[PDB]
Design a binder for this molecule. Sequence first.
Ligand SMILES: O=S(=O)(O)N[C@@H]1[C@@H](O)[C@H](O)[C@@H](COS(=O)(=O)O)O[C@@H]1O
Length: 205
Amino acid sequence: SVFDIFELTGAARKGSGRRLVKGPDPSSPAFRIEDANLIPPVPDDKFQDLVDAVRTEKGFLLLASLRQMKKTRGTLLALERKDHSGQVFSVVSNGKAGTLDLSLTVQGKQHVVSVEEALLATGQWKSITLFVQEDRAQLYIDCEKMENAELDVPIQSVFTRDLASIARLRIAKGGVNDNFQGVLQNVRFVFGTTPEDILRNKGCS
Ligand SMILES: O=S(=O)(O)N[C@@H]1[C@@H](O)[C@H](O)[C@@H](COS(=O)(=O)O)O[C@@H]1O
C-alpha cells in the first residue's frame, strides 16, 4: 500500500549522495540532498510493484515533505529512460514559476502541465499531497485550497507494462539543472487511500 522511495533506494551510506538530518516527522528520517546523481535508482523489481499498483488504481497518491531553496527548480521524482534519451515522467517543484510541473512523455511527445499557485520553494518545510487519477491532478499544500490541473494523457499511459525494463525511478534528480536543492522527507506513493483521508490524519479540516 505504501512505497517510500528513500527506503527503496537503499541505505544512505557515506557518499550516497544524501545526508541524514531532521524533518517535521521526528520518528522518520530526513535527507539533505548533496549530490542527487549518486543516489541509487529504485531497484527494478521494487519499481515493478509501483507500476502494477499505478496501473490498477489508474493513478496514485504522492506524499512529500520538502524544504526547498528559494527560486530554484527542484525535481522531486523522475522516471528516466535507461538508454539516457530522457525522462518519461517527472514532478518538478518549480520555484521560479511558483508551480508544480508534471511532465509526461508518451510516444516520443513530451507533455508538460503546471499546477498553478503552488509555491513550495521557501527555505522552510512544506507538505504536499498529489492525487493523480486518469488525466486529473489535484494538489494540496499542507491544509490549503486544493489546486487542480488536467493532463493531456491519462497517467497510466506513461506506466506501460514493460516500463521497469526501459526506465528507472530516480529521486531528487531530473533535468540537467533541476536536481533538488534542499531537504526531503517521506516521499511516498500511497495506494488504496484518498487525499481526503490523508488530510484528516495530518490534522487538517
Ligand atoms: O535553541 S533552542 O531553541 O534552545 N533548542 C531547541 C529545543 O529547545 C527544541 O525543543 C527543539 C525542537 O523544537 S520544535 O519546536 O521543533 O519542537 O529544537 C531546538 O533543539
